Write the structure tokens for this entry.
Amino acid sequence: VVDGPAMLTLQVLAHNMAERTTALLCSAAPDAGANTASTANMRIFDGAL
Amino acid sequence: CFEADIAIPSGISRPDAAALQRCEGRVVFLPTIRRQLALADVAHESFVSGGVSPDTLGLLLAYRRRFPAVITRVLPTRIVACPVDLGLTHAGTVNLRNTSPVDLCNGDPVSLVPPVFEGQATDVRLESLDLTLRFPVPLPTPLAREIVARLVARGIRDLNPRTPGELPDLNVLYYNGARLSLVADVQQLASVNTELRSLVLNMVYSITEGTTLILTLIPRLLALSAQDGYVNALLQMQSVTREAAQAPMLMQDGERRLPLYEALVAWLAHAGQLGDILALAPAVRVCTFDGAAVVQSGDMAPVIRYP
């Protein structure tokens, strides 16, 4: 149940919007605290839209 | 032994004759080589210079230019002492008394340190012959080299105040356990100053031209830090090495002089000799015949020659 002047105020769509989604991939290393010689080659990838 | 005697000069307090009996195996600093000598230059009143008594760094400098001697046999007429500097030619291994809180090891070099302990003053008093006696404390030599660096640096903090009064005391020692507290009462300046200068002047010559190339590998040190055990334990937490991390400077003349090999020579010449130029020379080594691996506090350990 949504009346006229609610969706009439959908006029404000012109101000902000979003174009499309984008997969973000920025990986990481072990921390200061587990970063040793064998773990220096270690990477962990994380994906998100 | 090349026998040297010290007679009992004048009178006896009758229990104090027994006090000379339980000093068998101790050390007398007599500033000579004599066939007979009075007991006046023996005691700490002779250790006292003109007007003033030495500090525990000055007593190091006072034990510098005198000669240690081993109590061998105690007569009521004389005391036969064997001149450590020469007459250590003993296959009989003339015996010493350990007067020290540390149970030592077998095989330690033993160097002599003035009494600086909180509870082992070694103060025995003679009142018929008005003299005061401080016996030196025989100790193992790495533990001996852990002490002399503390007491000079404690007197380095006697030059500059600046910091708040809560200083690290330099007064907690570590041998396998065994928390040791020593005495911090007086720090004479000239005993600190002349000891400080040779710490400066030797560290001058211990740097050379090819030494400078090693300084480039200071960030190379911490690269081994997070990838092994040995290095990370070698790298101290209270070190400037972890603090200084936060280059050939070409000047290359001739390049056939072995510049890196020549660096480790003169560094070892003066920075390699820092324990013995500040403190006394070790000439006493732990050597028990029965296979006993340690020597108790108060025991009579057999003594062999220079390490």
